[PDB]
């Protein structure tokens, strides 16, 4: 399967509740690392990283991110001045990462934002930085003189992928897991809409459909958003709003498809509180 390694850095100037610098690292969008400028320490966030790296690894990661904090402090000071903003809370963000597809092909990105808006983005084909605004153009020229694109491309295509491969092996069983959805049909009142609820599944892709009398039914359907659970699994629901009469006269069912397998629930499965 495809896998990814990503880092997201958040820098804040003038805040109290949050630290000056926060870094989170993720494999397949699941956090495995945390750092902030209050603790000044990079720490493990999964069992698979804990079992496979130790003090030497974390001391090195801590050192890199102390450096990142210092650079983020300096950077946000510069950009604020360029927008003529000497007061108030401002933010500086960096996200970067790499993906390894099955064919062994790789992708990668490197991006920065000021106050949550694009500032500079790496084009690693042309080895240039796309500046989103005039304020970013000074940075574009500086970084192109310092060969920053080249360094970043080197990291993304080599170092990042080398480590991603290690992490995938460390966490193989967790990262390659296929957990089927637990599916229920919910109804608050016999005359109310019926909700098909799917939870506890991984990976996140799921298809929820409704059928009337064995045929796909797309009218009066409200498909909910994909939502995260607390434990790294996911949930999603769809709601059918036909009347109790339409339900009485026909054979409606929900079909949940995940990993080429289907679960079906019918009126006989409907659960409710109060009852």
């Amino acid at each position: 399967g495809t896998h990814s390694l990503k880092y997201v850095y958040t820098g804040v100037s003038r805040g109290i509740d949050f630290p000056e610098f926060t870094a989170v690292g993720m494999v397949d969008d699941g956090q495995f690392m945390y750092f902030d400028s209050n603790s000044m320490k990079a720490v493990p966030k999964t069992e698979w990283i804990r079992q496979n790296e130790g003090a030497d690894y974390w001391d090195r990661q801590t050192q890199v991110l102390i450096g990142a904090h210092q650079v983020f402090k300096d950077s946000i000071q510069i950009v604020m001045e360029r927008f003529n903003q000497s007061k108030g809370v401002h933010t500086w963000q960096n996200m970067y990462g790499c993906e390894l597809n099955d064919d062994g092909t790789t992708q990668g990105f490197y991006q920065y934002a000021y106050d949550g808006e694009d500032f500079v983005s790496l084009d690693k084909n042309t080895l240039t930085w796309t500046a989103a605004n005039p304020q970013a153009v000074i940075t574009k020229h500086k970084w192109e003189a310092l060969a920053v694109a080249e360094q970043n491309k080197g990291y993304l295509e080599n170092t990042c992928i080398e480590w991603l491969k290690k992490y995938v092996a460390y966490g193989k069983d967790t990262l390659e897991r296929k957990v089927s959805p637990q599916v229920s049909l919910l109804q608050k009142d016999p005359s109310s809409p019926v909700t098909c609820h799917a939870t506890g599944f991984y990976p996140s892709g799921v298809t929820i459909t409704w059928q009337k009398n064995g045929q796909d039914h797309d009218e009066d359907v409200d498909l909910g958003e994909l939502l995260p659970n607390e434990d790294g699994s996911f949930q999603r629901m769809s709601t059918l709003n036909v009347g109790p009469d339409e339900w009485k006269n026909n054979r409606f069912s929900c079909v949940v498809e995940h990993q080429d397998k289907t679960i079906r629930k019918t009126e006989d499965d409907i659960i409710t509180n109060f009852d």
Partner: peptide, 9 residues
């Protein structure tokens, strides 16, 4: 592993 090399803007 995070990128070791950062440059200020």
């Amino acid at each position: 592993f995070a990128n070791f090399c950062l440059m200020m803007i």
